[PDB]
Amino acid sequence: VHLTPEEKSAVTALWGKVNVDEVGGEALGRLLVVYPWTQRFFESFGDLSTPDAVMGNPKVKAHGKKVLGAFSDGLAHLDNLKGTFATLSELHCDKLHVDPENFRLLGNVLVCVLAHHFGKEFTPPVQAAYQKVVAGVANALAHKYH
Amino acid sequence: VHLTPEEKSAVTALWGKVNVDEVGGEALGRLLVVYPWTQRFFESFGDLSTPDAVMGNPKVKAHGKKVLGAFSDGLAHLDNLKGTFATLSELHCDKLHVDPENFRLLGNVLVCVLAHHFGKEFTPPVQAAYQKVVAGVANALAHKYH
Amino acid sequence: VLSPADKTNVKAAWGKVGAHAGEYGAEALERMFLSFPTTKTYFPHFDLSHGSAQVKGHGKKVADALTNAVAHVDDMPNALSALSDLHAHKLRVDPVNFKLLSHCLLVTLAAHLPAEFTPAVHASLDKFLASVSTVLTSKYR
Amino acid sequence: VLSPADKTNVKAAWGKVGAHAGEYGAEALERMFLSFPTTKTYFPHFDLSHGSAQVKGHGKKVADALTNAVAHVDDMPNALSALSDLHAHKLRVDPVNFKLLSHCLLVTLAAHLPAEFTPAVHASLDKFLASVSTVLTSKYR
Ligand code: HEM
Ligand code: HEM
Numbered sequence: 001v002h003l004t005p006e007e008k009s010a011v012t013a014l015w016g017k018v019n020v021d022e023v024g025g026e027a028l029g030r031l032l033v034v035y036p037w038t039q040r041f042f043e044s045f046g047d048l049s050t051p052d053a054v055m056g057n058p059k060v061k062a063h064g065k066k067v068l069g070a071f072s073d074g075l076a077h078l079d080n081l082k083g084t085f086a087t088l089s090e091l092h093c094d095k096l097h098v099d100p101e102n103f104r105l106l107g108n109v110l111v112c113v114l115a116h117h118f119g120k121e122f123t124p125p126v127q128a129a130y131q132k133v134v135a136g137v138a139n140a141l142a143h144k145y146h
Numbered sequence: 147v148h149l150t151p152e153e154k155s156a157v158t159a160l161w162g163k164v165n166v167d168e169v170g171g172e173a174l175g176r177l178l179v180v181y182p183w184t185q186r187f188f189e190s191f192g193d194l195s196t197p198d199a200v201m202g203n204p205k206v207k208a209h210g211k212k213v214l215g216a217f218s219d220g221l222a223h224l225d226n227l228k229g230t231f232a233t234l235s236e237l238h239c240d241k242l243h244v245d246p247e248n249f250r251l252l253g254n255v256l257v258c259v260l261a262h263h264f265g266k267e268f269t270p271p272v273q274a275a276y277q278k279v280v281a282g283v284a285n286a287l288a289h290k291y292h
Numbered sequence: 293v294l295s296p297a298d299k300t301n302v303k304a305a306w307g308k309v310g311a312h313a314g315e316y317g318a319e320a321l322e323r324m325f326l327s328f329p330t331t332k333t334y335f336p337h338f339d340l341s342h343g344s345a346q347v348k349g350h351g352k353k354v355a356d357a358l359t360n361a362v363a364h365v366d367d368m369p370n371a372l373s374a375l376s377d378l379h380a381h382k383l384r385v386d387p388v389n390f391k392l393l394s395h396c397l398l399v400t401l402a403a404h405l406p407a408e409f410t411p412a413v414h415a416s417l418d419k420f421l422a423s424v425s426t427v428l429t430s431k432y433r
Numbered sequence: 434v435l436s437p438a439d440k441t442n443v444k445a446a447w448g449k450v451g452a453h454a455g456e457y458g459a460e461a462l463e464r465m466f467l468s469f470p471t472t473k474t475y476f477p478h479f480d481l482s483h484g485s486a487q488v489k490g491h492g493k494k495v496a497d498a499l500t501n502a503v504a505h506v507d508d509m510p511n512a513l514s515a516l517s518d519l520h521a522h523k524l525r526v527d528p529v530n531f532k533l534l535s536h537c538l539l540v541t542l543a544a545h546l547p548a549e550f551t552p553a554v555h556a557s558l559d560k561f562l563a564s565v566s567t568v569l570t571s572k573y574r
């Protein structure tokens with residue numbers, strides 16, 4: 001992914017303020033609530049019967065944190081996303097068989113969450129920069145398919 | 147690089163009976179009729195105002211023939227679809243900006259056309275083999291997006 | 293959203309299916325299971341072997357449902373409410389799977405009724421199945 | 434298909450926009466044009482520069498159309514027929530572009546109305562926009 005130095009700075013500035021304890025879980029949680037069929041991949045996560053149940057679920061928050069961490073690693077290796085996510089891609093594609101469109105969905109849900117947390121600070125330019133990142137991460141995750 | 151020895155034999159055998167001058171035009175014509183927004187990429191082709199107009203358009207039939215020729219090139223190099231369509235990928239992605247979902251739709255329309263022509267001969271196993279071919283062609287064309 | 297011509301085309305084509313609905317339903321399922329193996333995971337306890345009596349029975353279930361949807365093309369949400377509860381609420385079927393079965397239904401139709409499978413009818417049947425899929429994958433209760 | 438709950442969620446949330454319609458509509462467009470450059474190809478005659486007065490005005494038309502859609506949530510095909518003629522018959526907009534704008538509208542709502550953008554409301558707003566998108570991209574006349 002190609003981010004202008006101005007975009008890199010903006011992205012990094014915002015990411016450094018992200019609440020690593022909640023953002024990931026809210027992103028994964030919203031994914032499960034907005035696109036309920038994605039719940040089928042988290043059978044063992046316990047109660048996902050209602051929105052509040054999903055969002056407050058300890059396993060959802062913990063797993064969302066790992067998801068967030070994968071994005072943080074992606075930001076730290078924008079020049080090599082395919083290698084960085086090789087392991088994760090084998091897992092999500094060869095084992096879980098997650099449809100690529102869902103990767104895109106989560107990437108955008110994350111964008112919505114960042115917008116939710118930062119409000120006006122999440123300007124159109126900052127979003128555009130993040131859209132390049134999530135698209136890049138999403139692509140890398142589905143590369144084991146190609 | 148996907149695709150079993152038996153699936154390759156099935157694809158090759160059926161393809162030897164395909165009418166190269168008709169199938170492509172029928173597939174492209176149906177793409178334009180079933181998914182009307184695709185007509186936007188063929189503004190210079192003339193009258194596309196009705197199903198009969200589309201299916202009777204000489205330019206649509208002529209172009210479908212080139213499209214089918216490319217599919218044939220792919221079937222002759224099943225283990226290297228990425229290379230076979232590299233140039234076409236640049237054109238459709240970088241130049242024309244055709245959303246990849248459309249590549250998948252054309253592939254499935256082609257499958258419908260094969261089913262239509264072959265009838266009972268287009269058995270579930272033959273279809274399964276062809277689904278692998280069109281999915282591979284679609285991914286190869288979207289390569290410039292990866 | 294279906295046009296008046298779409299409704300006309302769907303009713304005529306499905307009518308032509310007639311008493312073969314069950315047979316075509318089973319073939320479409322078999323085509324889906326074989327072409328897109330991941331779809332089998334939605335049926336963990338089914339006998340999905342070729343020619344399976346269970347699949348034959350399910351094909352008839354699916355076909356009859358479509359016949360019902362065709363009869364209520366102007367009132368599908370209400371007509372398919374129970375089927376939505378099942379696919380959307382309980383099974384939570386990923387919508388991509390409905391596109392797969394919808395495609396196999398079209399392939400099955402094209403393979404059996406060539407004279408009826410015109411570009412216009414093809415287009416109409418696709419919109420209809422996409423509409424049905426939307427209703428079954430949405431939780432509207 | 435929207436549930437009674439989705440309808441009330443959308444009305445309450447979108448109702449908060451109010452006099453911010455043009456502002457939010459314009460912002461949603463700016464976000465789409467900047468994040469997904471390919472969308473600009475549908476507005477070749479437009480001045481798409483940031484702050485553009487043309488984009489601001491168009492943002493208002495889009496916002497107002499949504500407000501109208503919310504008001505006619507039970508008969509959108511009828512209420513949105515003019516817009517469908519425009520986007521599906523004349524412009525032949527690829528449906529993927531509607532997903533992009535819908536995403537940007539959600540982003541805009543989340544950035545301005547954090548209290549309104551709950552998980553359930555987010556789900557309803559998404560279904561609502563997908564519904565409007567389907568109508569605007571279908572040729573049903
Ligand atoms: C595109 C962004 C995504 C990222 C960055 C991501 C990241 C991760 C990470 C870091 C793990 C943990 C792997 C490990 O500990 O070995 C994981 C596991 C998993 N992911 Fe994803 N994921 C993404 C999308 C998805 C989607 C869309 C689904 C499906 C709806 C999904 C389903 C799963 C499942 C089922 C697991 C296994 C959890 C368990 O049972 O332990 N992921 N993901
Ligand atoms: C997925 C299979 C597809 C194959 C194998 C294919 C193949 C071709 C070929 C062989 C050409 C000729 C290139 C040249 O010599 O300049 C071409 C051109 C083109 N294709 Fe495709 N194509 C595919 C899908 C699509 C789709 C889905 C669209 C858009 C909906 C599309 C739109 C076009 C356009 C606009 C041109 C240029 C036509 C012109 O000369 O005006 N193609 N394609």
Ligand code: HEM
Pocket residue numbers: 331334335353354357358375378379383385389390391393394421424425428
């Ligand atoms: C044209 C769309 C579809 C129609 C009309 C349809 C119709 C039906 C009908 C009539 C039943 C029987 C309900 C009952 O037992 O009372 C059923 C069950 C079921 N359907 Fe579908 N269906 C569709 C697509 C799908 C898809 C795409 C999947 C997943 C790949 C799916 C998965 C299931 C499953 C798992 C069951 C329950 C099987 C069991 O008894 O365990 N359906 N469907």
Ligand code: HEM
Pocket residue numbers: 472475476494495498499516519520524526530531532534562565566569
């Ligand atoms: C569901 C979301 C959308 C809504 C509610 C919407 C609404 C509208 C409205 C109200 C107009 C003005 C019609 C008039 O009064 O003449 C319009 C025009 C237009 N829309 Fe959309 N639109 C949507 C999505 C899109 C998308 C996704 C694209 C393409 C990326 C698009 C491209 C256009 C274009 C090119 C025009 C014509 C502008 C002009 O030449 O004046 N719209 N839209």
Ligand SMILES: *Cc1cc(OC)ccc1OCc1cccc(CO)n1
Pocket residue numbers: 293294368369418419422423424426427434435567571
């Ligand atoms: C008309 C239509 C077209 C597509 O894509 C081709 C998807 C869905 C759809 O409509 C589903 C539908 C049918 C009847 C009632 C409602 C909502 O009240 N949605």
Ligand SMILES: *Cc1cc(OC)ccc1OCc1cccc(CO)n1
Pocket residue numbers: 293294426430434435509510560563564565567568
């Ligand atoms: C309800 C609904 C959900 C989705 O999500 C994929 C897409 C479209 C859709 O409904 C469109 C709609 C709305 C109102 C009336 C009709 C047909 O009369 N279709």
